[PDB]
Amino acid sequence: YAEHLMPTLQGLLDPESAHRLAVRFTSLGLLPRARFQDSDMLEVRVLGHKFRNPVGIAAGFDKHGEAVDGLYKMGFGFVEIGSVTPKPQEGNPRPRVFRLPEDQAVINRYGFNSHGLSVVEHRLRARQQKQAKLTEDGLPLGVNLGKNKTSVDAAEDYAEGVRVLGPLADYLVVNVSSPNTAGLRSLQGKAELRRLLTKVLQERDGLRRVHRPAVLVKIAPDLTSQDKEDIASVVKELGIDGLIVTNTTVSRPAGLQGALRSETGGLSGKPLRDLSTQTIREMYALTQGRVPIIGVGGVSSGQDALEKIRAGASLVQLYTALTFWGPPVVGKVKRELEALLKEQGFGGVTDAIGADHRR
Numbered sequence: 001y002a003e004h005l006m007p008t009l010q011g012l013l014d015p016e017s018a019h020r021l022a023v024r025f026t027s028l029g030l031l032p033r034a035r036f037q038d039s040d041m042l043e044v045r046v047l048g049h050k051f052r053n054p055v056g057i058a059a060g061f062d063k064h065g066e067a068v069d070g071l072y073k074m075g076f077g078f079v080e081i082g083s084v085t086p087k088p089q090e091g092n093p094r095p096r097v098f099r100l101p102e103d104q105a106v107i108n109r110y111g112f113n114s115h116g117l118s119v120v121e122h123r124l125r126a127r128q129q130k131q132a133k134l135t136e137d138g139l140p141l142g143v144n145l146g147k148n149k150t151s152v153d154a155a156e157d158y159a160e161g162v163r164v165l166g167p168l169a170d171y172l173v174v175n176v177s178s179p180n181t182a183g184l185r186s187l188q189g190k191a192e193l194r195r196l197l198t199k200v201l202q203e204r205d206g207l208r209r210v211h212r213p214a215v216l217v218k219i220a221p222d223l224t225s226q227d228k229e230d231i232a233s234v235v236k237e238l239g240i241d242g243l244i245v246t247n248t249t250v251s252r253p254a255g256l257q258g259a260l261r262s263e264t265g266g267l268s269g270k271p272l273r274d275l276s277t278q279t280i281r282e283m284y285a286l287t288q289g290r291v292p293i294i295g296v297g298g299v300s301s302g303q304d305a306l307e308k309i310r311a312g313a314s315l316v317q318l319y320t321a322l323t324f325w326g327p328p329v330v331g332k333v334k335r336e337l338e339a340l341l342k343e344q345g346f347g348g349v350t351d352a353i354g355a356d357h358r359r
């Protein structure tokens, strides 16, 4: 895979075609069931759920909820689908995703291509009780909500997503951090965020108890210090259940080598890694370690995962590493993380969460 398979599928196909085929293959279960059996050391209890291991698939890989079961088979401890927008929409014109192999990075400007809430609702309903069992067995499901390009009331878009997919999700994500929808990231500002999240939480609280998900906010890696302070304040004021830290970056860190480095879009993978880790670290401090963080950005190894956990993440996610290393990277991250936890004297993941802040 890392050397023998992915280079062929990568070089042979443009990245979007490769992704579509990967989703299809995954959905059909055409991957070996992951051999790595999860150690008890990797179990995490957070967000009202048991997570058999802390390595999830980040939003964007399975935008429309087509490959959830195949992703659990790949070894992910939790699956996040989306972003899902209220109405179907096509996203931006192609090409809209670009590989930067020399940087182990991707730039994407999909623009919330989405089958829409109704289609995803019916897809998740078809496996709703299967998911209930998976969740009880430590394999929760997150649903990441977006807003339509032409929406005239962003908060209502997210409210609709809460109402339609909230009952099918263990947690929901208010994605206010895509770089590829005009104006979306302004919803991270204090006043807009408070109003938006108040409405989202009211809608969530109006769901029946067994259908009431945790609500997390997914934030950018490009926030000012003021933005981060404001988000932390709003999250604590409103009782937001957690943060996902981070989405892709609109920055272009010095040193990128890929020919496509100046394409518009969000940058993911290795050049984002430490920017994301530092955002986790700051958000954990600003929330006094009381707000669960799902850490994401440039995770391709156990060390990458543990750095985010020690910075304050209770769980991590990855996407871009899968595009370069294929399915074996999941077990690799988990095996490496277990080894490092043992080496560094942690009894398990839980003991390592935020450990850097206690040094």
Ligand SMILES: Cc1cc2c(cc1C)N(C[C@H](O)[C@H](O)[C@H](O)COP(=O)(O)O)c1[nH]c(=O)[nH]c(=O)c1N2
Binding pocket: 058, 059, 060, 061, 063, 082, 083, 097, 106, 108, 110, 112, 144, 175, 178, 218, 246, 247, 248, 267, 268, 269, 270, 272, 296, 297, 298, 299, 317, 318, 319, 320, 321
């Ligand atoms: C092609 C593609 C598409 C998407 C994403 C990424 C990529 C590469 N990401 C962001 C993703 O969830 C994650 O936050 C970043 O990509 C950082 O993680 P990695 O560096 O990829 O492990 C993303 N995030 C989100 O909240 N909703 C989405 O629809 C998408 N779509």
Ligand SMILES: O=C(O)c1cc(=O)[nH]c(=O)[nH]1
Binding pocket: 060, 083, 108, 109, 110, 111, 112, 113, 175, 177, 178, 179, 180, 247, 248, 266, 267
């Ligand atoms: O659909 C996309 O363009 C997209 C959404 C998002 O939240 N993040 C990202 O990098 N791309």
Ligand SMILES: [Cl-]
Binding pocket: 167, 168, 211
């Ligand atoms: Cl329901």
Ligand SMILES: [Cl-]
Binding pocket: 208
């Ligand atoms: Cl009722």
Ligand SMILES: [Cl-]
Binding pocket: 302, 303, 306, 307, 340
């Ligand atoms: Cl480490």
